[PDB]
DNA sequence: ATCGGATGTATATATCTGACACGTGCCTGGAGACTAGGGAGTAATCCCCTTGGCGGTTAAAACGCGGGGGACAGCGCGTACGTGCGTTTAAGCGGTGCTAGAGCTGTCTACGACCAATTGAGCGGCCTCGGCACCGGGATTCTCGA
DNA sequence: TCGAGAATCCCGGTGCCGAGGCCGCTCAATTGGTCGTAGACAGCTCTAGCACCGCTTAAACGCACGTACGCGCTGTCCCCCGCGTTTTAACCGCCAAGGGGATTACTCCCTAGTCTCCAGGCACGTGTCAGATATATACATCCGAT
């Protein structure tokens, strides 16, 4: 009726009901469990030697005993090497961030247990700012590696959706506190389930993340003018926001500090921005825009590569414009 | 008592190139340019109000007529230029 | 579950080699180089994504989510191509 | 009452909003004209004229001239990729053509 | 007597009629109680298409009979 | 055995398809092509079935008329086979690639 | 009063003068519409439709058909020299193409 | 709910005067409706532009006539002018 | 007052001068009667439309705007003469 | 014994001369006579503003120069250097004029 | 050039379905009659600008000679495309079912047309200086024959 | 590989007319109300678009041979380019005359608008024949062989 796994780092055990939560046509998530064992197999790189002699790649998951030969034995044969829990060497420190392969598995696993009907995410007004789309694991990993977040930056995702972007950032960056705000009620409802489920599968592997908060709200409100300007790095997926609210975001971004980073789907400033007397109040005056390297499967609504752009606030460009306006 | 855009084209030079001029032969080409894209945008926005059985041309019909007529990056920066002027007109 | 959209991926292959022969036979051509088919899949790639996008943007102006037969007519007839029989 | 402000000044524009609004009413385009429609349209026409005068003033400087001649408007439009798409069916009087010799024609 | 006018949507209504009432009178009473116009109604009695000129007693309709309503619309 | 000379069956297919009016692209791969170009607009689109037939009728009329000009460019160069530089020379004079 | 005569019947036409007059008033073409303008325009549209149906009914007879099919409209327009000038930028659905093989391609 | 309008009654009357024994399919009648609506918008759109060039606010049969000369090729424009003037002189006589 | 054979006033040096703004470096001898036939067909189409704009205005002078209007409805719109 | 350029050198020098200038290339009085004799077949005594004859010439210059650009592409496509009458006919056929 | 085998193709008769074409009732849009107001027809007048002619200067067109480069035909070779046969992939079809969204009606309010009064922006005319065109004289470069 | 020679760019001067700034003055845009209706919005309904299913088989895919076409090479020759002399007429500047473009005033007849009315065209239903299909046969077309 159920089947249980035990944590290596002493956390609460897991639950898998025998009326299985099959999700798509064929991933039929016992593949979730047999791949969950393989990441705890090397944490701790000695489950492969502790469990070589009897197991092999096995089909026929429709029987209850095929998991049962694998799962309670995993609750049992863990103690062939867990038994060193006392006396001379502790297990792994909880202050470890996961690898990119482990983090990809946890974020896929937290997504499967959280969203129940992903076709509900398509319930929006057409061509509105509230359309839904996602950024893949590979672009956010590109985004984290091509900004350089120090130990004092603050990350905010405007329009966080279900919140999978801030979970990858909070588990791959040593910063203070991260935020995500979402207006639409359907992905913000899944974001609360996504919030709880990320934490309990994070102590289960025994890994730390930075602290975060997923909120409901509208970032175009007066509460958010003060706290957009006080953050260091901003992620936003503005692909279908439209020009009326992209114009509103520019006059919130104009109060950011020096070295303020902005990663967006569409640019807030041209790549070939020439400054003259006609566009001195534009936001491209005070920022430098570069296009990141595009990768395959970068977004979730199309298959072709969509490239996101990087914005860096510097108020040393308009001065260099003013440093050649005087002597001729 | 005949009108043109020559006063207004000459103001846009001094913002862009503050120490160049135009000849009068090329000012007349700039007046032919402004009248041409006036009747392209207003002609396409007239059909958009008629396809949807509306009787009013608003700033939304001008916006989607710009997106039909201008190519690529011209349409991106004319839409952001037009929405900046409308939101400044309605907040003043 | 997974996911909110099933992404269609290639679909230009799609327009196959014995379908380009038998578009060129109506054009009246007798012999065809082997490099035509990749050239022809790129033209019908540029075309038909100029028609759509100019077909959508008539759909979003009508607030309407469903691109109809009109707005394909009006997409064509804007690019200098008038199509009869769908019908305006 | 208060001193009159033009609609171009409160929109932050250089082109006349009131003249564009009159030309939309007297052009038989629709029965009725919204209030933001001449503000939006005058901003697009001011943007498009600022791009040509940007590029034509650069072409006048490359020939060491301080005035824009119809040749400089021709060189500006045909060397910009997107201005050449708008004005591809447009001929400019006393504009000439771009210098372009096919590479086969050059001597060996 | 009464009849049952079943629709194609799943709605079966109870209408108090008389055998001298025509099909034109049946199509007039549903507009009085449901708001459906007379050019949007087709009636079914054992596979027949009923005509406005004849009455209910001309087609041998017993009380508590199931009449089906095919929804015609002006265009398509 | 029996075997036609090359060019004979090809001329037989000129007469076959210039006589008919049918669509020559398969309908489900074309419809699947249309729905994946429209994925670039983020939002969900629905495509009334008469609109996909209007796109296919126009795309095939575009390509048949393009192979007619492509064929004239190959005959002009004293060739009988069409070649990718014939498509490029036809689309440049027509005013498409420039 | 006297029994009503349609404006098509007193002009000797088959096309509706009163419907064309309504479409000119509701199409934003001018502020005002003259009385002879829908009579003139309905006679031109009736003339142009009588030429195509002349030539397409001849094309339907050459294929031993008694109904006009979109192929017969295509064969009528493309074989007439002046109907091909009007409808040169027009594609007709399920119309096909004219049979035309270049003389170089024919076998020796 | 709203009823439609087309030229299908009138195209069918012209066809019986020209070929009284032939018929027409429904897809060919939809192309003839597209043809009449296309030539209507060309003539009325050009005649609208002629009244604006000459600073007039009315469209008369003089402006339909010269829009027919601008749009139709040579012999089509010759016969369509003669068909149009024949209808106006019959309309204004009685 | 009758005026005839003026395509020969468009000379061989003038057609050669037009081909070299077009980028042609060598010209066969049969080009010059082709170019006069192409230019006659082009001028007949524009003047026919320009004269029927000035007949409708009830004038006897072909103005520059009649030429600009005639060129615009052939796709060949032209800046620099008042349009 | 006199100086003598090889054939093709002066022609390329004339490509660069006339692609730099913006002047009209047809003589003005022979062009004006041609306009006045084509117009005799439409209306009997026309009057022709001098700006209208210059608008007709500026359009005819631009039509022919753009036609010789496409004519030149058809001659290179046939691996030639000379333009021939079949190059003009192919260029007008694809453009949609000769048909 | 002719001949026969084989493959395609046109020919004729049957049979069968669904779409054209006809008919009927009905409602809404076109027609008849009338009034009021202004668009344009009509005339008259002004003066701009088009036409016609003239003469002189000289740039450009025309004519011819001469020679080399390019068009064109022919030939030979190798490759890549057509033809056809066997294998394999998925299109097409028909049928079922859900549900959503496009189309519709009914309130209702905010937005734009209309009108009147007022004034400053833009247009016309006006000086006037400087950009640019012209002219000449110098250096630099390119083509061509060695 | 290098000197002659013919174009071409570069560096200054003179002269000028067209672009730029100033000013005076209407008239068109702004201000301010006001009304009525277009459009936004909520609710409701049911057509049609999406998705799935299994099956049949049309069509795509893959393979292999061979043929004919692309393409490169060579040689001929004539036609096109370059140049110099002569000839023609474009071009400029000027004068003169008058058709007709452009404007203004006046008034009339034509069109918008209104209400009443009624008949033509639309929706709906129904029956039959045109055309599609199939099969079998007749015959025209291609191609290897002689
Ligand atoms: C394209 S989704 C991005 C989801 C997430 N950031 C990701 O890439 O995985 C953009 C989201 O922004 C949300 N959004 C739009 N306007 C918003 C606003 N004004 N305040 C908060 N969220 C908003 C919409 O609900 C939409 O779901």
Per the domain annotation, does E14 fall within a domain?
yes
Q: Which residues line ligand 1 (CB under 6 A)?
A: A 129-130, 132-135, 157, 159-161, 164-165, 181-184, 187, 218-220, 237
Per the domain annotation, does H2 fall within a domain?
no
Interface check E73 vs H, CB under 8 A: yes
Per the domain annotation, does E76 fall within a domain?
no
Same domain, A259 and A201: yes
Neighboring chain H residues of G14 at a CB cutoff of 8 Å: 10, 13-14, 17
Per the CB < 8 A criterion, the answer to whether G60 and H23 are in contact is no
Tell me the C-alpha to C-alpha distance, in Å, between residue H68 and each of A326, C54, G17, H86.
63, 31, 17, 15
Determine the Cα–Cα distance for residues E33 and E31; give it in Å rounded to an integer. 5
What is the set of domains in chain J, with CATH numbers? 9-95 (1.10.20.10)
Kindly report the three-state secondary structure assignment for every residue of chain A. Answer: CEECCCCCCCCCCCCEECCCCCCCCCCCCCHHHHHHHHHHHCCCCCHHHHCCCCCCCCCCCCCHHHHHHHHHHHHHCCHHHHHHHCCCCCCCCCCCCCCHHHHHHHHHHHHHHHCCCHHHHHCCCCCCCCCCCCECHHHHHHHHHHCCCCCCCCEEEECCCCCHHHHHHHCCCCCCEEEEEECCHHHHHHHHHHHHHHHHHHHCCCCCCCEEEEEECCCCCHHHHHHHHCCCEEEECCCCCCHHHHHHHHHHHCCCCCCCEEEECCCCCCCCCCCCCCCCCCHHHCEEEEECCCCCCCECCCCCCCCCEEEEECCCCHHHHHCCCCCC
Report CB contact under 8 Å: D39, B43: no
Helix, strand or coil for residue J79? coil
Chain I interface, best mutation among D73, D76, D91, by max I CB count within 10 A: D91
Per the domain annotation, does G36 fall within a domain?
yes
Residue A164 neighbours by CB distance under 10 Å: 25
Strands A211-216 and A177-182: parallel
State the residue for tokens 């409160």.
D10
Determine the Cα–Cα distance for residues D100 and J97; give it in Å rounded to an integer. 25
Annotated binding site of A for S-adenosyl-L-methionine: 132-135, 155-164, 182, 218-219
DSSP code at position I5:
-
Determine the Cα–Cα distance for residues F3 and F7; give it in Å rounded to an integer. 12
Separation of first and last alpha carbons in chain A:
85
Interface check I32 vs J, CB under 8 A: no
Cα R_g (chain I), whole angstroms: 16
Helix, strand or coil for residue F78? coil
Domain residues for the domain of B83 are: 5-90
Per the domain annotation, does D1 fall within a domain?
no
Give strand K nucleotides closer than 7 A to any protein Cβ.
6-9, 19-21, 27-33, 39-41, 49-52, 60-62, 67-72, 80-85, 90-92, 101-105, 111-113, 119-124, 131-133, 143-145
Total count of domains within chain H: 1
Determine the Cα–Cα distance for residues A195 and A171; give it in Å rounded to an integer. 13
Domain residues for the domain of C47 are: 1-88
**Rounded to 5 degrees, what angle do the CA atoms A304, A307, A312 make?**
175
Same domain, A181 and A304: yes
State the residue for tokens 């949807």.
B52
G91, two tokens: 């594609």
Interface check I75 vs D, CB under 8 A: yes
Nearest to A321 by CA among A259, A289, A273: A273
Strands F81-82 and C31-32: parallel
CATH of the domain at E50: 3.10.20.90
DSSP code at position E8:
S
Per the CB < 8 A criterion, the answer to whether A123 and A186 are in contact is yes
Per the domain annotation, does E16 fall within a domain?
yes
F27, two tokens: 């309908």
Report CB contact under 8 Å: C84, G93: yes
Domain residues for the domain of D79 are: 7-105
Contacts 24+ apart (CB under 8 A), D71-80: D71/D95, D71/D96, D71/J22, D72/B26, D73/B26, D73/B29, D73/B30, D74/D98, D74/J22, D76/D52, D77/D52, D79/D55, D80/D51, D80/D55
Q: How far is CA A245 from the centre of its chain?
A: 24
Q: How far is CA A275 from the centre of its chain?
A: 36
Backbone angles phi, psi at A288, to 5 degrees: -120, 125
| Spatial CB neighbours of F57, under 8 Å, sequence gap ≥ 6 | C83, C85, C86, F23, G91, G93, G94
Nearest to H14 by CA among G75, G43, G49: G49
Q: How far is CA A56 from the centre of its chain?
A: 34
Backbone angles phi, psi at A313, to 5 degrees: -75, 120
- Please tell me whether any atom of strand L lies within 7 Å of the Cβ of E74: yes
Helix, strand or coil for residue C71? strand
A195, two tokens: 């919030």
**Atom number of ligand 1 nearest to Cα A235:** 6
CATH of the domain at B26: 1.10.20.10
Concatenated DSSP letters of F28-50: HHHHHHHHHHGGGGSS-----HH
Determine the Cα–Cα distance for residues D52 and D73; give it in Å rounded to an integer. 7
Total count of domains within chain G: 1
Q: Is G12 left (phi over 0), alpha (psi -120 to 50) or beta?
A: left
Tell me the C-alpha to C-alpha distance, in Å, between residue J36 and each of I65, J19, J83.
17, 30, 31
Tell me the nt nearest to F74, Cα to C1'.
L70
Query: Which chains share 3+ C-beta pairs under 8 angstroms with D?
Result: A, B, F, G, H, I, J
Per the CB < 8 A criterion, the answer to whether H69 and I52 are in contact is yes
**Atom number of ligand 1 nearest to Cα A160:** 6
Determine the Cα–Cα distance for residues J52 and J46; give it in Å rounded to an integer. 12
**Atom number of ligand 1 nearest to Cα A236:** 6
C6-65 residues touching G, CB cutoff 8 A = 26, 28, 30
Dihedral Cα D11, D16, D21, D27, nearest 10 deg: -150
Q: Name beta bridge partners: A5.
A: none
Report CB contact under 8 Å: A122, F39: no
Per the CB < 8 A criterion, the answer to whether J42 and I45 are in contact is no
Element (H, E) at E7: strand E2-7
Determine the Cα–Cα distance for residues A186 and J45; give it in Å rounded to an integer. 78
Determine the Cα–Cα distance for residues G100 and F11; give it in Å rounded to an integer. 11
Name the structure determination technique: cryo-EM
By C-alpha to C1' distance, K69 is nearest to J7
Same domain, A158 and A247: yes
Nearest to H80 by CA among G86, C55, A4: G86
Residue C59 neighbours by CB distance under 10 Å: 25
Domain residues for the domain of E8 are: 2-71
Per the CB < 8 A criterion, the answer to whether H53 and I52 are in contact is no
Determine the Cα–Cα distance for residues E13 and E41; give it in Å rounded to an integer. 14
Nearest to J74 by CA among I31, I74, G104: I31
Element (H, E) at B62: helix B59-69
Domain residues for the domain of A137 are: 100-322
Determine the Cα–Cα distance for residues A243 and B60; give it in Å rounded to an integer. 12
Nearest to G21 by CA among G9, G4, G7, G10: G7
Determine the Cα–Cα distance for residues A53 and D58; give it in Å rounded to an integer. 78
- Please tell me whether any atom of strand L lies within 7 Å of the Cβ of H90: no
CATH of the domain at A301: 3.40.50.150
| Spatial CB neighbours of H76, under 8 Å, sequence gap ≥ 6 | G48, G51, G82, G83, G86
Determine the Cα–Cα distance for residues G99 and C26; give it in Å rounded to an integer. 8
Cα R_g (chain H), whole angstroms: 16
Which residue owns the Cα nearest ligand 1 atom 26?
A130
DSSP code at position E43:
E
Record the resolution, in angstroms: 2.6
Per the CB < 8 A criterion, the answer to whether J74 and I28 are in contact is no
Q: Is the dihedral of CA A292, A295, A297, A303 positive or negative?
A: positive
Per the domain annotation, does D36 fall within a domain?
yes
| Spatial CB neighbours of I56, under 8 Å, sequence gap ≥ 6 | H50, H54, H62, H63, H66
CATH of the domain at C71: 1.10.20.10
Per the CB < 8 A criterion, the answer to whether E75 and H1 are in contact is yes
**Rounded to 5 degrees, what angle do the CA atoms A230, A232, A235 make?**
110
Which residue owns the Cα nearest ligand 1 atom 14?
A159
Interface check G12 vs J, CB under 8 A: no
Q: How far is CA A231 from the centre of its chain?
A: 18
Residue F86 neighbours by CB distance under 10 Å: 26
Nearest to A160 by CA among A138, A130, A116: A130
Residue J92 neighbours by CB distance under 10 Å: 19
Dihedral Cα B71, B77, B81, B84, nearest 10 deg: 130
Determine the Cα–Cα distance for residues A121 and A141; give it in Å rounded to an integer. 24
Centre of ligand 1 to C-alpha I57, Å, is 60
Per the CB < 8 A criterion, the answer to whether F34 and F52 are in contact is yes
CATH of the domain at A35: 1.10.260.60
Neighboring chain G residues of F15 at a CB cutoff of 8 Å: 99, 101
Q: Is F42 left (phi over 0), alpha (psi -120 to 50) or beta?
A: left
Nearest to A94 by CA among A164, A33, A8, A196: A8
Helix, strand or coil for residue C76? strand
Total count of domains within chain E: 1
Counted across chains F and G, CB pairs separated by less than 8 A come out at 38
On the question of a cis peptide bond just before residue A44, with omega within 30 degrees of 0, the verdict is: yes
Determine the Cα–Cα distance for residues E37 and G5; give it in Å rounded to an integer. 34
Centre of ligand 1 to C-alpha C9, Å, is 25
Nearest to D51 by CA among E66, B75, E32: B75
Residue H22 neighbours by CB distance under 10 Å: 19
Total count of domains within chain C: 1
CATH of the domain at G32: 1.10.20.10
Determine the Cα–Cα distance for residues A286 and A315; give it in Å rounded to an integer. 5
Determine the Cα–Cα distance for residues A99 and A96; give it in Å rounded to an integer. 9
């Amino acid at each position: 009726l159920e089947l249980r796994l035990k944590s290596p780092v002493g956390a609460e055990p897991a639950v898998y009901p025998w009326p299985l939560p099959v999700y798509d046509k064929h991933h039929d998530a016992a593949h979730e469990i047999i791949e969950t064992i393989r990441w705890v197999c090397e944490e701790i790189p000695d489950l492969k030697l502790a469990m070589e002699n009897y197991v092999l790649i096995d089909y026929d998951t429709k029987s209850f005993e095929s998991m049962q030969r694998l799962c309670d034995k995993y609750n049992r044969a863990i103690d062939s090497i867990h038994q060193l829990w006392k006396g001379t060497t502790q297990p792994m420190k909880l202050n470890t961030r996961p690898s990119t392969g482990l983090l990809r598995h946890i974020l896929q696993q937290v997504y499967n247990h959280s969203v129940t009907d992903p076709e509900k995410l398509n319930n929006y007004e057409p061509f509105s700012p509230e359309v839904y789309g996602e950024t893949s694991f590979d672009l956010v990993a590109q985004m984290i590696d091509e900004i350089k977040m120090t130990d004092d930056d603050l990350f905010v995702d405007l329009g966080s959706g279900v919140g999978q972007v801030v979970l990858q950032v909070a588990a791959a960056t040593n910063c203070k506190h991260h935020y995500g705000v979402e207006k639409a009620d359907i992905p913000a409802k899944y974001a609360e389930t996504m919030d709880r489920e990320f934490r309990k599968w994070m102590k289960w592997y025994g890994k730390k993340h930075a602290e975060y908060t997923l909120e409901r709200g509208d970032f175009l409100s007066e509460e958010w003018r003060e706290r957009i300007a006080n953050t260091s790095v901003i992620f936003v997926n503005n692909f279908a926001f439209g020009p009326e609210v992209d114009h509103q975001l520019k006059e919130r971004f104009a109060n950011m500090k020096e070295g303020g980073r902005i990663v967006s789907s569409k640019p807030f400033a041209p790549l070939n921005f020439r400054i003259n007397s006609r566009n001195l109040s534009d936001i491209g005056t005070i920022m430098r825009v570069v296009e990141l390297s595009p990768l395959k499967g970068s977004v979730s609504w199309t298959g072709k590569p969509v490239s996101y752009y990087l914005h860096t606030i510097d108020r040393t460009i308009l001065e260099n414009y003013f440093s050649s306006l005087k002597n001729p | 008592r005949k009108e043109s855009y020559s006063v207004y084209v000459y103001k846009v030079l001094k913002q862009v190139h503050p120490d160049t001029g135009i000849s009068s032969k090329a000012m007349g080409i700039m007046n032919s340019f402004v009248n041409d894209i006036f009747e392209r945008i207003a002609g396409e926005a007239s059909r958009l109000a008629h396809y949807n059985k509306r009787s009013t041309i608003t700033s939304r019909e001008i916006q989607t007529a710009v997106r039909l007529l201008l190519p690529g990056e011209l349409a991106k920066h004319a839409v952001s230029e037009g929405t900046k002027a409308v939101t400044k007109y309605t907040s003043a | 579950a997974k996911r909110h959209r099933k992404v269609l991926r290639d679909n230009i292959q799609g327009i196959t080699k014995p379908a380009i022969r038998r578009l060129a036979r109506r054009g009246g051509v007798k012999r065809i180089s082997g490099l035509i088919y990749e050239e022809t899949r790129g033209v019908l790639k540029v075309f038909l994504e100029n028609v759509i996008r100019d077909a959508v943007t008539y759909t979003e102006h009508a607030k309407r989510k469903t691109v109809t037969a009109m707005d394909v007519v009006y997409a064509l007839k804007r690019q200098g191509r008038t199509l009869y029989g769908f019908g305006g | 009452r208060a001193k009159a402000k033009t609609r171009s000044s409160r929109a932050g524009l250089q082109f006349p909003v009131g003249r564009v609004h009159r030309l939309l009413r007297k052009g038989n385009y629709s029965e009725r004209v919204g209030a933001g429609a001449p503000v939006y349209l005058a901003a697009v026409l001011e943007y498009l004229t600022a791009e040509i005068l940007e590029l034509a003033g650069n072409a006048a400087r490359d020939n060491k001239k301080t005035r824009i001649i119809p040749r400089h408007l021709q060189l500006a439009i045909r060397n910009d990729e997107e201005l050449n798409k708008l004005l591809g069916r447009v001929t400019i009087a006393q504009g000439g053509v771009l210098p372009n010799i096919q590479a086969v024609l050059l001597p060996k | 007597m009464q009849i049952f006018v079943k629709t194609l949507t799943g709605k079966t209504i109870t209408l108090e009629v008389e055998p001298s009432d025509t099909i034109e009178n049946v199509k007039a009473k549903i507009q009085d109680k449901e708001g459906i116009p007379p050019d949007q109604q087709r009636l079914i009695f054992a596979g027949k298409q009923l005509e406005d000129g004849r009455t209910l007693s001309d087609y041998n309709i017993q009380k508590e009979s199931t009449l089906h309503l095919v929804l015609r619309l002006r265009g398509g | 055995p029996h075997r036609y000379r090359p060019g004979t069956v090809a001329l037989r297919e000129i007469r076959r398809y210039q006589k008919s009016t049918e669509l020559l692209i398969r309908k489900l791969p074309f419809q699947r092509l249309v729905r994946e170009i429209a994925q670039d607009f983020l939002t969900d689109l629905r495509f009334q079935s008469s609109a996909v037939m209007a796109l296919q009728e126009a795309s095939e009329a575009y390509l048949v008329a393009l192979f007619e000009d492509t064929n004239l460019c190959a005959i002009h160069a004293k060739r009988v086979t069409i070649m990718p530089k014939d498509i490029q020379l036809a689309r440049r004079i027509r005013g498409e690639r420039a």
